[PDB]
Amino acid sequence: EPDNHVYTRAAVAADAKQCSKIGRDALRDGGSAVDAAIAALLCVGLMNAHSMGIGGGLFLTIYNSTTRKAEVINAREVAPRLAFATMFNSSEQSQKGGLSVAVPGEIRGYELAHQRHGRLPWARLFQPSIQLARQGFPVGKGLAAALENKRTVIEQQPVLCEVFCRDRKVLREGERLTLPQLADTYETLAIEGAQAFYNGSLTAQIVKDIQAAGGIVTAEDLNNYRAELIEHPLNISLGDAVLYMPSAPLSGPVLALILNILKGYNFSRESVESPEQKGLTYHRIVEAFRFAYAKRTLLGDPKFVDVTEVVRNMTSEFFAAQLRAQISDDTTHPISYYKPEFY
Amino acid sequence: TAHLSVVAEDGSAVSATSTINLYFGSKVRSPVSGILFNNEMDDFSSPSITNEFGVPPSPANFIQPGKQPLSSMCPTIMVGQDGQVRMVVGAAGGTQITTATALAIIYNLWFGYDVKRAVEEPRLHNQLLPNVTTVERNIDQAVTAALETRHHHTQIASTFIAVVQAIVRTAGGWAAASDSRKGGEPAGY
Numbered sequence: 001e002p003d004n005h006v007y008t009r010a011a012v013a014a015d016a017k018q019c020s021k022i023g024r025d026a027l028r029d030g031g032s033a034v035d036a037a038i039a040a041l042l043c044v045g046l047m048n049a050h051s052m053g054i055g056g057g058l059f060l061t062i063y064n065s066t067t068r069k070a071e072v073i074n075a076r077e078v079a080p081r082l083a084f085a086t087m088f089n090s091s092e093q094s095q096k097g098g099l100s101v102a103v104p105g106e107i108r109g110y111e112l113a114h115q116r117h118g119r120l121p122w123a124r125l126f127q128p129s130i131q132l133a134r135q136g137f138p139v140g141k142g143l144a145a146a147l148e149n150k151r152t153v154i155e156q157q158p159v160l161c162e163v164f165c166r167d168r169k170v171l172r173e174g175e176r177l178t179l180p181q182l183a184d185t186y187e188t189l190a191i192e193g194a195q196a197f198y199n200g201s202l203t204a205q206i207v208k209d210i211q212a213a214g215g216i217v218t219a220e221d222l223n224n225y226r227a228e229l230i231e232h233p234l235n236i237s238l239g240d241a242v243l244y245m246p247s248a249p250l251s252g253p254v255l256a257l258i259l260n261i262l263k264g265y266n267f268s269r270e271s272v273e274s275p276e277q278k279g280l281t282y283h284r285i286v287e288a289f290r291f292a293y294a295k296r297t298l299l300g301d302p303k304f305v306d307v308t309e310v311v312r313n314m315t316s317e318f319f320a321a322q323l324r325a326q327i328s329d330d331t332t333h334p335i336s337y338y339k340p341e342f343y
Numbered sequence: 344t345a346h347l348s349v350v351a352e353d354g355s356a357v358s359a360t361s362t363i364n365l366y367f368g369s370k371v372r373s374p375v376s377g378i379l380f381n382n383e384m385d386d387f388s389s390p391s392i393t394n395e396f397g398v399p400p401s402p403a404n405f406i407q408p409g410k411q412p413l414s415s416m417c418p419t420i421m422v423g424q425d426g427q428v429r430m431v432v433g434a435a436g437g438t439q440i441t442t443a444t445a446l447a448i449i450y451n452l453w454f455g456y457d458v459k460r461a462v463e464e465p466r467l468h469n470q471l472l473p474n475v476t477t478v479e480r481n482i483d484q485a486v487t488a489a490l491e492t493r494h495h496h497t498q499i500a501s502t503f504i505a506v507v508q509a510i511v512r513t514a515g516g517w518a519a520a521s522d523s524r525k526g527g528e529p530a531g532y
């Protein structure tokens with residue numbers, strides 16, 4: 001509370017106050033944006049264990065003020081070598097158990113970002129979080145709601161109740177959470193490096209855990225995982241600004257489409273000052289969502305599907321103009337009016 | 344999913360989104376490593392069934408070995424004419440990520456709301472499939488009215504719609520916000 005959050009030198013906006021501070025401290029110790037980013041992320045994996053962490057994957061949009069260039073680091077999970085198109089027959093199937101696990105890419109993401117942009121030692125980035133994980137912290141609001149939301153699946157699950165329950169009932173806001181095993185793991189990662197996860201001393205335990213839960217990840221999946229540098233991120237123009245965002249497999253193209261559609265209306269302060277204008281503004285906004293979502297189903301991993309033209313269409317001004325021209329100010333439309341496409 | 348934003352003193356920046364997919368992902372946690380595994384396989388399309396969002400089979404997003412499933416994430420960096428970072432923004436929470444990201448940018452860049460209002464401001468969401476417009480419980484109800492009179496059947500989220508972390512440059516410096524919906528706060532110096 002003793003802060004207006006306007007900073008003259010540096011800022012970290014994260015979804016747990018403590019992780020914002022961990023990243024802020026990394027910057028004060030001389031670390032780069034990326035160093036702070038990684039450190040904050042490791043903390044985020046603890047404080048919001050339900051949201052993200054080294055069991056998952058990520059993307060990073062990085063701007064370098066020295067080179068004045070942007071880049072993206074792709075480190076989203078991949079399907080195991082053994083995965084196939086018909087492997088699930090319900091949503092439930094692709095949502096719980098070992099089979100629903102993709103090959104985590106977090107740590108290789110951090111590594112690759114760090115090799116290219118790091119200025120603090122690798123171990124330095126893990127230090128605060130290991131500290132945090134052993135120390136324990138109070139459950140913040142976000143995670144308490146997650147716990148509440150999922151109390152049935154957590155409480156009936158012993159391996160989850162071990163860290164997430166007190167007296168076999170989910171932790172509540174303010175109660176102390178400690179993540180002992182993740183602290184070990186984080187420490188192993190700090191010492192042994194990224195390698196320990198992918199082809200190293202943690203690697204068999206990961207396979208054993210996923211597979212014992214019905215999954216099909218194998219060591220070879222982990223050994224083969226590589227994060228990817230993308231030298232030229234997606235970009236659009238907004239006024240005299242330029243936004244950088246990731247291409248497929250992410251929603252860069254959708255967001256580019258949404259915004260390119262809406263920039264044509266020349267929105268301003270005026271657009272919300274009377275409910276008449278504010279009404280139409282929000283209607284057009286929802287219409288832009290619907291038009292952009294229609295084209296989304298054409299998207300997939302560009303390594304496996306040629307979405308070159310789809311993406312060029314989605315981030316282009318002609319295409320956007322073409323869809324704005326079809327938005328009715330007086331009405332929304334049937335799904336089919338947007339021309340959803342699956343080929 | 345979690346988003347965070349960073350601007351370092353030299354003006355370099357990072358927008359980063361990261362996820363295990365569902366709350367607690369697959370619900371598989373290792374009793375040895377404490378690692379909680381993602382259920383990211385759920386973000387693929389199936390040739391057989393329609394997803395919980397009503398999206399029918401979309402072969403562009405079928406499972407293949409080595410393949411990355413389509414994601415709703417969009418971590419973004421807005422960069423000035425001058426080459427100075429203008430904004431760092433992205434969002435997290437279910438499938439509402441792209442619409443929420445758009446909204447915060449609209450809110451700040453076009454409506455002229457300050458960075459904490461861009462983030463705190465009521466949101467709404469339509470992804471075509473499902474075919475419904477969801478509004479936050481405290482949206483301006485004139486927005487609700489104006490949409491229903493255009494034949495949008497709206498519903499009210501029972502929780503909230505996404506979680507946005509953002510940093511905007513002002514002439515005063517870097518203005519930062521974290522979403523109260525999830526309870527974070529920024530830090531900096």
Ligand SMILES: O=C(O)[C@@H](CCB(O)O)NCc1c[nH]cn1
Nearest residue numbers: 344364414415416435436437438
């Ligand atoms: O799209 C993605 O990359 C992640 C985002 C999930 B996060 O928890 O917001 N999975 C999307 C999703 C949300 N609900 C079902 N699938």
Ligand SMILES: *[C@@H]1O[C@H](CO)[C@@H](O)[C@H](O)[C@H]1NC(C)=O
Nearest residue numbers: 086087088089090093094099
């Ligand atoms: C579902 O059915 C398919 C096709 O018959 C089969 O290959 C797969 O093993 C099944 N998956 C599950 C998760 O039951």
Ligand SMILES: *[C@@H]1O[C@H](CO)[C@@H](O)[C@H](O)[C@H]1NC(C)=O
Nearest residue numbers: 032064066067116117118355
């Ligand atoms: C920008 O690029 C330089 C090389 O020119 C590299 O050393 C560094 O990672 C980047 N700068 C920052 C501040 O990250």
Ligand SMILES: *[C@@H]1O[C@H](CO)[C@@H](O)[C@H](O)[C@H]1NC(C)=O
Nearest residue numbers: 070231232233234235236247
């Ligand atoms: C903008 O658009 C595309 C991205 O695929 C590419 O032609 C170009 O490199 C991009 N520009 C920048 C500065 O990234």
Ligand SMILES: *[C@@H]1O[C@H](CO)[C@@H](O)[C@H](O)[C@H]1NC(C)=O
Nearest residue numbers: 298308309310311313319322
């Ligand atoms: C791109 O451009 C036009 C839409 O104006 C369309 O005819 C064409 O099929 C599009 N290409 C792809 C790959 O969607």
Ligand SMILES: *[C@@H]1O[C@H](CO)[C@@H](O)[C@H](O)[C@H]1NC(C)=O
Nearest residue numbers: 332333334335474494495496
């Ligand atoms: C979808 O929602 C819109 C607005 O509520 C409505 O007009 C339309 O009939 C609904 N169904 C389909 C299949 O588009």
Ligand SMILES: [Cl-]
Nearest residue numbers: 179181182377
């Ligand atoms: Cl743990």
